[PDB]
Each structure stands twice: as structure tokens, then as C-alpha cells.
């Protein structure tokens, strides 16, 4: 996105490129929205919840067994929210394909700009 929005300033002087610039900025903005939302979900729906579980448990822990169980619960909550199960594998693959497509779009945009 940085390259998009800098190069569309550089190449604004030539109007021929503007359609490419705009279409790339749109695709990149869609990707940016998705990634930002998904990271906010992982941070709060995975990390925030798992850390709150861990901290509440440890802060009410009276036994070492209790501490161990609390740490396991923290990690389990993080895994569950982060789609770390053996049943989320398809959604994980889709996430990974989206990542790889975003890298590909980056490469294609850099090629177009070159």
C-alpha cells in the first residue's frame, strides 16, 4: 500500500497510469481492511481473551497444579480463537492462500510500476 500510494503520486504526472494506480489501490485497500480486521480479531478474540483467562487464573491460583492448569487454559483459548485446532485446517489453508495471494499482488503491482 505504501508503494501504491507513493507511486500514484509519482506517476500522477502521467495520466496513462492512473487506472492501474486506482485499481491497485482498491485491491490493496481491500486486503488492508481484511488483514487489519483479522488481526484485531486475533488480538482481542484470541490474545486478549487467552491472556485475561491466564491472568485471572494465575491471580486466583492457590496451587501449583492450579497454575499449570491456568497456563494450559490460556494456551488453549489462544489456540481455539486462533484456529489452532485440527478441524480449522481448511480455514487455515484459506488464510494462508489469502496471504500468498497478497504477496503475489504485491509482486504484480511492483512489476506494473517497474
Amino acid at each position: 500500500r505504501k508503494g501504491h500510494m507513493c507511486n500514484a503520486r509519482l506517476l500522477r504526472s502521467m495520466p496513462e497510469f492512473s487506472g492501474v494506480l486506482h485499481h491497485c489501490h482498491i485491491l490493496a485497500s481491500e486486503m488492508v481492511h481484511f488483514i487489519h480486521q483479522m488481526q484485531y480479531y486475533v488480538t482481542f478474540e484470541v490474545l486478549e481473551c487467552s491472556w485475561d483467562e491466564l491472568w485471572n487464573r494465575v491471580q486466583r491460583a492457590q496451587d501449583l497444579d492450579h497454575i499449570i492448569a491456568a497456563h494450559e487454559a490460556f494456551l488453549g483459548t489462544v489456540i481455539s480463537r486462533c484456529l489452532l485446532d485440527s478441524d480449522s485446517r481448511a480455514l487455515l489453508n484459506q488464510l494462508r492462500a489469502v496471504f500468498d495471494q497478497i504477496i503475489e499482488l504485491q509482486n504484480t503491482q511492483d512489476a506494473i510500476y517497474r
Binding site: 494506480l21 481491500e30 480486521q37 478474540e45
Partner: protein, 426 residues
């Protein structure tokens, strides 16, 4: 590794806002006005190296460059308790104490006159930054120095760092009051032009909306510029909260901008701050939805909204607030793309006393900002049609031959308005 950001404070208003910003940051991080870490702030979780440098005397020095065409504000900063906060090598002051005379063209010529001092400072800071993320130019579009020189600096940052983001905090003049600067509409048009064409992200600071917020929400009868700048400093602290508190996501300004500016030409960002004076996620969002708390004068739909909530927040209350916001359709999104509404939970700074366990900032991209650019264009056209205050412009190089720089600024701001409307359109 640090991700340094250089703050450029331009003209009287920019320098005063930078000074109050540094005071607010010091207060939020528990840093004294001299740059010394307070004993209560020795164990802070904030990354100071991003925005401050540490001197050999344990002084934290702002990565701030103060440029003004008038001596009054620079002298006030150097005579303030925060004089030791700024790195002295990063301060350029024009020896030509004539200022821009509230003339945008004069401010541009002054930026050219002080180019070497300013670009020497910028280059020194760039080489002195381990991982400079970018530059934030804080200036006003309506003055002479801050407007003309601000547009010049936006251009020069775009030229010097054409692969680096250039963000501006551009103060838009009050559209409802008669500007004391008869050329103010020209300055405003030139600044809107530079934000639309040469900036990756323009934070619109509408003096009309800021005054309205300061009066209606802070209970300031006749809100002073000082109270508005205190709100601005609160906003700047909230904007740096993701830098000061290490999180898992969106820990950099690059990521913020990429989340905020989906259209490179449509790079005008609206800001929102709260409190303007036990808040639940839902109660916060309900108060945020009140028009009196939006910090952008937009004449339209929201493209995206990010609420950064700092303090002790129940994530389940955040989720409930998001669910209620969705059910209530509290934000209108672009029809040609998915509605980007994010909520980040962050902790508040431990060093700033907060009467409120939780504060929140809303950043909203809303197409009515095009109406603000249209208003600025109309003010420019109102001045140009009267040839008002042009005798001083013809003395300045940008206006020496013709007023084409004003007309181009009006065109650029029109293009910005039209792009904002297209972004309002599928």
C-alpha cells in the same frame, strides 16, 4: 528496532501544537519538560526511542523540527520549560523575520528561503534515525507561513522520500468566520491541493469542528486556542498509544495509514477524540456516535471507522458493543467494499492521570470531507473573484507572474472532492 517518526511543526500554530504535543507526551510517559525520565516513569512500557532521542544526560529529546516564519512562537518555546525537550540540532528558524504576512505565496517563498536550514535538519534527523518510519507535518493551511511553507514542505517531503509515507496534520481554516487573511482561501486551497496530490494521508483539522467540540464538550465558554490545542495534544497522545503500549497488531504508523487510506488520492483522514471534557464499550461507542465528538468538519458516508479504546476494557463488552453497533447500523460504509469497522483494545498510559479508567479515539473516513474541500475551494473562488489581497501575492514567486498556483490549488481540491464523492459511490 525503533521506528522513528519525525514531527515537523510549521509556523506559529504548528510550533505551538508541537510544543503542547510534547508536553502531553511527557505527561503521558512520565517525562519531565527537560527530557529526564521521571522516577515513576523509569519502568515505563513506552518506546521513547521512536519519537524522542536520549541525550548523554538521560535527557529525552523530541524528534521534532520547529520551523516558523515568526519569532514569537519559537522564542516562547525556547523560553518554555520544554526548551530542553527538543533536540537543538533539529530546530530551523528563518533569519528573515518578516514572516509570510498571512500570505500563502509568501509562506512558500519563506520555505524556499529557509530551505537549507530545514532540509539540513530533515536530513540530519533522517540519518540519525535507525528505522525512520516517516514524517508527520503539522501545519495550518490558512496562515501565511504554515500554509505556504506547509505546502512547500509537503511537496519537498514527497520529493525527498517518494517511497516513504508523508502524513500531514493539516489545520483547515474556519469556513464560517471571515479569515483575517484575505488570501487565506488561497492558502487553504494550496494546502488542500498538496494533501490531495502529494500526501499519502492528510489528517483534516477543521477549526470549526474543533471549536464546536471544545465549546460544547469541554464546557469552555468561548474555547481558547489553548483548549483546542489541549484537545489536539490528547489526540496526538491517543495516536501514539499504539506506539507506547506494545500490542500484537497495528503497532506501526505504516499499518495505521494502510488501514485508513484505501484510495491513494483519497488520502484525507478524519480524526476523532474522546473524552472532550464506567464507560462500557457500548456506552463509549454510543457517545462517539454523537456528532459533537467528531474532529473533522465534513459537510456522505463513512468509509471506515477504527476505535482505539485505551484503559481497562472488558473484551466481552467490546464484542457486545461491536454487535450492538452492527445491529444498529451506527456507521454507513462504502457500498463498493466491505464495511471496515475495527475496535482495538489497548491499555492506557500509566504515567498520565486519567479520571476515566477508559478513554477512546475514533478515526473515521467519511465522504463529507469532500464537502470541506468544496467549501475551501469556494472560499478560494470567493477571494480570487474579488482579487482580494493579491498585491502581496504578486510579490511572491508562486504568485509573481499569475495566480495559477491558487487556481491549481482550487483544481486539486476539486479533484479531491470529486474523488471523495467517487469513494462515496460504488
Amino acid at each position: 528496532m525503533p521506528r522513528e517518526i519525525i514531527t515537523l511543526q510549521l509556523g506559529q500554530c504548528g510550533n505551538q501544537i508541537g510544543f503542547e504535543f510534547w508536553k502531553q507526551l511527557c505527561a503521558e510517559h512520565g517525562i519531565s519538560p527537560e527530557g529526564i525520565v521521571e522516577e515513576f516513569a523509569t519502568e515505563g512500557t513506552d518506546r521513547k526511542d521512536v519519537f524522542f532521542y536520549q541525550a548523554d544526560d538521560e535527557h529525552y529529546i523530541p524528534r521534532a523540527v520547529l520551523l516558523d516564519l515568526e519569532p514569537r512562537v519559537i522564542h516562547s518555546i525556547l523560553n518554555s520549560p520544554y526548551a530542553k525537550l527538543y533536540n537543538p540540532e533539529n530546530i530551523y528558524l528563518s533569519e528573515h523575520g518578516g514572516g509570510a504576512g498571512n500570505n500563502w505565496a509568501s509562506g512558500f517563498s519563506q520555505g524556499e528561503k529557509i530551505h537549507e536550514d530545514i532540509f539540513d535538519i530533515i536530513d540530519r534527523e533522517a540519518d540519525g534515525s535507525d528505522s525512520l518510519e516517516g514524517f508527520v507535518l503539522c501545519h495550518s493551511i490558512a496562515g501565511g507561513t504554515g500554509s505556504g511553507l506547509g505546502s512547500y514542505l509537503l511537496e519537498r517531503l514527497n520529493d525527498r522520500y517518494p517511497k516513504k509515507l508523508v502524513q500531514t496534520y493539516s489545520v483547515f481554516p474556519n469556513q464560517d468566520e471571515m479569515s483575517d487573511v484575505v488570501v487565506q482561501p488561497y492558502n487553504s486551497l494550496l494546502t488542500l491541493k498538496r494533501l490531495t496530490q502529494n500526501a499519502d494521508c492528510v489528517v483534516v483539522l477543521d477549526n470549526t469542528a474543533l471549536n464546536r467540540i471544545a465549546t460544547d464538550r469541554l464546557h469552555i465558554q468561548n474555547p481558547s486556542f489553548s483548549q483546542i490545542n489541549q484537545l489536539v495534544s490528547t489526540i496526538m497522545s491517543a495516536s501514539t498509544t499504539t506506539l507506547r503500549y506494545p500490542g500484537y497488531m497495528n503497532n506501526d504508523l505504516i499499518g495505521l495509514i494502510a488501514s485508513l487510506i484505501p484510495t491513494p488520492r483519497l488520502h484525507f483522514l478524519m480524526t476523532g477524540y474522546t473524552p472532550l471534557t464506567k464507560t462500557t464499550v457500548l456506552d463509549v461507542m454510543r457517545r462517539l456516535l454523537q456528532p459533537k465528538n467528531v474532529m473533522v468538519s465534513t459537510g456522505h458516508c463513512y468509509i471506515a471507522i477504527l476505535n482505539i479504546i485505551q484503559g481497562e476494557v472488558d473484551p466481552t463488552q467490546v464484542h457486545k458493543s461491536l454487535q450492538r453497533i452492527r445491529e444498529r447500523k451506527l456507521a454507513n460504509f462504502i457500498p463498493w467494499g466491505p464495511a471496515s469497522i475495527q475496535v482495538a483494545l489497548s491499555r492506557k498510559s500509566p504515567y498520565l492521570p486519567s479520571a476515566h479508567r477508559v478513554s477512546g479515539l475514533m478515526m473515521a473516513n467519511h465522504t463529507s470531507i469532500s464537502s470541506l474541500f468544496e467549501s475551501s475551494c469556494q472560499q478560494y473562488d470567493k477571494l480570487r473573484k474579488r482579487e482580494a489581497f493579491l498585491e502581496q501575492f504578486r510579490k511572491e514567486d508562486i504568485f509573481k507572474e499569475n495566480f495559477d498556483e491558487l487556481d491549481r490549488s482550487r483544481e486539486v481540491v476539486q479533484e479531491l472532492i470529486d474523488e471523495y464523492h467517487a469513494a462515496t459511490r460504488p
